Amino acid sequence: QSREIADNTYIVLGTMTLNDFNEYFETDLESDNVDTIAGFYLTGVGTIPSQEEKEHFEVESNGKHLELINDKVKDGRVTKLKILVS
Amino acid sequence: QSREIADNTYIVLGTMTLNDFNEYFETDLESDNVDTIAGFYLTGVGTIPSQEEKEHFEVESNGKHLELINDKVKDGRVTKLKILVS
Numbered sequence: 001q002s003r004e005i006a007d008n009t010y011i012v013l014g015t016m017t018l019n020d021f022n023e024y025f026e027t028d029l030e031s032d033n034v035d036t037i038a039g040f041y042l043t044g045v046g047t048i049p050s051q052e053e054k055e056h057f058e059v060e061s062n063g064k065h066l067e068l069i070n071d072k073v074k075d076g077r078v079t080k081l082k083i084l085v086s
Numbered sequence: 087q088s089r090e091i092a093d094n095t096y097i098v099l100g101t102m103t104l105n106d107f108n109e110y111f112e113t114d115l116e117s118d119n120v121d122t123i124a125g126f127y128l129t130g131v132g133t134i135p136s137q138e139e140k141e142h143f144e145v146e147s148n149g150k151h152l153e154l155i156n157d158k159v160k161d162g163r164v165t166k167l168k169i170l171v172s
Contacts, residue, residue, distance in 0.1 A: 034161055042162035043134050076122075076125040077125075077163070
């Protein structure tokens with residue numbers, strides 16, 4: 001569900017569960033009525049981004065700073081995210 | 087995919103395709119990179135709504151005025167919409 005593409009830089013599938021995300025990244029992200037990393041990102045930014053109009057969401061968890069950015073969007077779904085760690 | 091619940095008032099599944107929606111409602115809704123009515127609504131409002139913080143989107147098509155409102159949201163997906171016609 002997650003692939004390292006450069007140092008501290010990853011592509012994750014939007015459908016990756018928050019529990020799997022948290023296990024991989026050693027974080028503790030959570031949000032009400034959210035199950036997946038796309039859900040967490042979308043509820044955090046509050047907007048359907050696009051490639052032209054990317055949306056960045058920054059959070060801190062377990063001493064890691066994460067920057068989440070849309071990498072692919074389909075029918076209003078963020079299907080891939082770029083994750084940059086600290 | 088669509089159910090009449092009161093006069094000129096409908097509940098539609100978010101996964102209803104725009105082509106099926108348009109056939110049912112006699113409209114011509116379209117948007118780039120969108121396939122379903124949820125995709126159209128979400129790209130139009132630009133925000134993940136919630137039940138507490140509903141989002142309304144109004145459009146005109148083929149002489150019909152449509153008001154689209156979230157009825158159910160799951161993991162950032164609008165899964166059901168209320169549609170009010172003219």
